[PDB]
Amino acid sequence: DTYKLILNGKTLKGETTTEAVDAXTAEKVFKQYAXDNGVDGEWTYDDATKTFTVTE
């Protein structure tokens, strides 16, 4: 299924999607993507919209 990430960084913002078998693999892609963007922070997931958010 399609999973979405919302990134709220101190210096940047972003949004991306990935196709994954489970919300496990999507989280462990997004928690590499937020790696690529130098963003570490507080993480939440919304099952309704399959959307993760990280805020620095």
Q: Walk me through the domains of the chain, giving residue ranges and CATH numbers.
A: 1-56 (3.10.20.10)
HEC sequence for the chain: CEEEEEEECCCCEEEEEEECCCHHHHHHHHHHHHHHCCCCCEEEEECCCCEEEEEC
Q: Which residues contact 9 (CB under 8 A, 6 or more apart)?
A: 37, 38, 39, 56
Q: Which residues contact 4 (CB under 8 A, 6 or more apart)?
A: 15, 16, 17, 49, 50, 51, 52
Give me the resolution in angstroms, 1 decimal.
Answer: 1.8
Distance of CA 17 to the CA centre of its chain: 8
The method recorded for this entry reads X-ray
